[PDB]
Amino acid sequence: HWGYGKHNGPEHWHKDFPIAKGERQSPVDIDTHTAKYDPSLKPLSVSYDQATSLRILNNGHAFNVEFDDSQDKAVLKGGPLDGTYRLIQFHFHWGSLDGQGSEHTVDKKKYAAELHLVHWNTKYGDFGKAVQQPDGLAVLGIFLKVGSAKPGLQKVVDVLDSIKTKGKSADFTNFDPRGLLPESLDYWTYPGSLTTPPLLECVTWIVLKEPISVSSEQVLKFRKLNFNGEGEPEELMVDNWRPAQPLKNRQIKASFK
Numbered sequence: 001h002w003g004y005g006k007h008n009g010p011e012h013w014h015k016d017f018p019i020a021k022g023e024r025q026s027p028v029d030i031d032t033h034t035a036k037y038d039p040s041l042k043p044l045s046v047s048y049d050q051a052t053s054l055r056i057l058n059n060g061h062a063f064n065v066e067f068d069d070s071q072d073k074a075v076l077k078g079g080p081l082d083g084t085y086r087l088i089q090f091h092f093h094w095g096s097l098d099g100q101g102s103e104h105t106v107d108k109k110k111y112a113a114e115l116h117l118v119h120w121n122t123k124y125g126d127f128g129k130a131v132q133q134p135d136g137l138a139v140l141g142i143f144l145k146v147g148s149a150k151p152g153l154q155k156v157v158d159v160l161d162s163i164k165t166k167g168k169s170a171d172f173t174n175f176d177p178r179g180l181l182p183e184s185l186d187y188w189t190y191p192g193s194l195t196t197p198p199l200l201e202c203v204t205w206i207v208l209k210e211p212i213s214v215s216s217e218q219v220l221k222f223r224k225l226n227f228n229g230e231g232e233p234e235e236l237m238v239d240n241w242r243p244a245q246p247l248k249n250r251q252i253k254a255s256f257k
């Protein structure tokens, strides 16, 4: 099935998922000189105080930290969003070397990694119904650069040993996603898609301008994860990022002047 290797990677996805060549695909290059400040944007409200993490799963592509979304506990609202969007999970994309790993790029600049916090529109009742709607999802994207350690990430880093291979999960309750955010909520926004198959075009993308810094040893531990399942030959989980896709006359708006 789909992956990130020569034979099952981004160049192959369109065959099972035709939308791969659609009109609102993600990620994209953010050309800072073409993006326009949008005064009609409301302030962004990230409300992760009551967040109820459940567990962490190696899904054979990345790792997912999952949340209880049966109530309005951790929500994204404001900005380009109408209504309330519930946090369902987060995951990362990263590279084999520090000069690559992010999905979105900024004036062609690739970061070492990128964090995605995934939310669904509560008017649709559940995630599965939301992914049938043009405004069903919102994903908050955050760039990672190598420098000082990120304290709020270490609990995640700590547990990676326990989920080395595809299909492994560990209890991951009481994790606070507020520790993964940069200081500024300045962002670019555009309408886009999931960056993995099924590549559904139901996402409002909100990409933060300010990267977080993570340590060399923190990213190294990401790169020790496996794509393969237990007892299979070792394929290091690295370079699990889709490259930038055609903007196609979409408008990237900036929240900042």
Ligand SMILES: CN(C)c1nnc(CS(N)(=O)=O)s1
Pocket: 088, 089, 116, 118, 139, 193, 194, 195, 196, 197, 198
């Ligand atoms: C079912 N969910 C929560 C997801 N499906 N594909 C995902 C990857 S991405 N890059 O957030 O679109 S996240």
Ligand SMILES: [Zn+2]
Pocket: 091, 092, 093, 116, 195
């Ligand atoms: Zn993602």
